[PDB]
Curated annotation (Swiss-Prot):
Changing residue 235 to F: Strongly reduced interaction with GP1BA carbohydrate chains. Belongs to the serine-rich repeat protein (SRRP) family. Has a short and long Ser-rich region with a basic region between them. The SRR domains themselves are comprised of inexact repeats of SASESASTSASV. SSR1 has 6 repeats, SSR2 has 200. The Ser-rich regions are both glycosylated. The basic region (BR) binds to whole cell lysates of wild-type but not bacteria deleted of this gene; it also recognizes whole cell lysates of S.aureus strain ISP479C probably via SraP, but not lysates of S.pneumoniae TIGR4. The predicted pI of the basic region is 9.51. This is Platelet binding protein GspB. It is found in: Secreted, Cell wall. It comes from Streptococcus gordonii. S.gordonii, a commensal oral cavity bacteria, is among the bacteria most frequently identified as being the primary etiological agents of subacute infective endocarditis (found in 13% of cases). Both SSR domains in the unglycosylated protein bind to Asp2 and Asp3; glycosylated protein binds less well. Interacts with the human cell surface glycoprotein GP1BA. The record marks 193, 234-235 as: Important for interaction with host glycoprotein and virulence.
């Protein structure tokens, strides 16, 4: 990624008459730094010369003057020469090391109708007339470049997010990073296969905010009353400013196949919200229900839970999935093997 910036002015000779403005553009992929120096000499002349100093954390790659590669005059300072035009640009590109930190650029600039050489460059305004006899400038700039960030961001998400059919939910994840700088657009909640909430869970929504040095990820939505009961693996995948991700596409795929976990993974569990019958079932002996009575009990649980479909229980069969004990305690075993238990005494009276 790129960032375009304007560096600090460390020093500038008030008697300079060339530099119009300086900007910087850093590419954090290549870690190339570009210093752009816009020039409007009062005395254009034919030739432009630039004595360039850079901090030890940079090493020069390219220097262009008026769009063309500058002749390298050679050597703390290095001479570059090229064409002088009234609206000119000197562009200096450096490789920044891995550390980054404060970067500096120093400049001694001239125009001249003479060939500009290392023996004839003036070091101060007062020596200009006797040497290059044109325009002159003298400045130093500084700015700060981030350290190379190779450490992935870390998501903290509940290991399990449980939601209920017919109800809304809201959970929260957090992301941190050593750089404390993130890419919120590339921070998502998704299933394995694509950047989408996933087939069967299209209702899964999220939003991302930066709160201080953390990301706050809201995971929320409304669960349809007829969505599939069971569990799903989903992933919080966050990207830092440098482009590091907590879990890569390859890693997610391996984790899904091997049944292992990645940072940011959670299990999304969809549950039915069970309701105890309010309608009383009357039995002969509350400790030994007859088979006829157990069927009354199953029907009453079905009545009190009308959104519980055959396909929602074990083996898609109400008789298999809703079992009733000798004391009328009812177990509802769902298609996924999870279960709810209703105490029989809650809704069973002795006749
Ligand atoms: Ca990082």
């Amino acid at each position: 990624a790129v960032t375009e910036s304007a560096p600090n002015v460390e020093y500038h000779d008030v008697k300079g008459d060339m530099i119009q403005s300086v900007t910087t553009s850093f590419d954090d992929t290549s870690r190339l730094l570009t210093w752009t120096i816009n020039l409007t000499p009062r005395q254009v002349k034919s030739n432009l010369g630039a004595l360039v100093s850079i901090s030890g954390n940079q090493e020069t790659r390219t220097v262009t003057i008026n769009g063309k590669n500058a002749a390298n005059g050679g050597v703390a300072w290095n001479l570059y020469t090229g064409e002088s035009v009234n609206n000119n640009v000197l562009r200096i590109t450096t490789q920044v090391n891995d550390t980054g930190g404060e970067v500096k650029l120093g400049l001694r600039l001239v125009t001249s109708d003479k060939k500009i050489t290392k023996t004839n460059l003036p070091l101060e305004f007062s020596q200009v007339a006797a040497t290059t006899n044109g325009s002159w400038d003298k400045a130093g700039y500084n700015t700060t470049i981030v350290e190379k960030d190779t450490e992935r961001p870390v998501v903290n998400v509940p290991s399990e997010i449980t939601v209920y059919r017919g109800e809304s939910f809201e959970y929260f994840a957090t992301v941190t990073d050593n750089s404390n700088a993130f890419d919120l657009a590339k921070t998502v909640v998704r299933w394995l296969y694509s950047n989408q909430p996933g087939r069967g869970t299209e209702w899964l929504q999220y939003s991302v905010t930066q709160v201080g040095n953390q990301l706050k990820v809201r995971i929320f939505g409304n669960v349809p009353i007829d969505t599939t009961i069971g569990d799903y693996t989903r992933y919080v995948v966050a990207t830092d400013a440098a482009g590091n991700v907590n879990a890569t596409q390859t890693e997610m795929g391996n984790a899904a196949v091997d049944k292992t976990s990645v940072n940011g993974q959670f299990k999304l569990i969809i549950r039915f919200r069970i309701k105890t019958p309010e309608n009383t079932v009357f039995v002969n002996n509350p400790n030994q229900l007859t088979e006829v009575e157990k069927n009354l009990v199953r029907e009453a649980v079905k009545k009190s839970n009308p959104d519980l479909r055959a396909q929602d229980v074990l083996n898609s069969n109400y008789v298999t999935g809703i079992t009733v004990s000798n004391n009328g305690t009812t177990t509802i075993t769902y298609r996924d093997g999870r279960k709810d238990i209703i105490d029989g005494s809650k809704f069973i009276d002795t006749r």
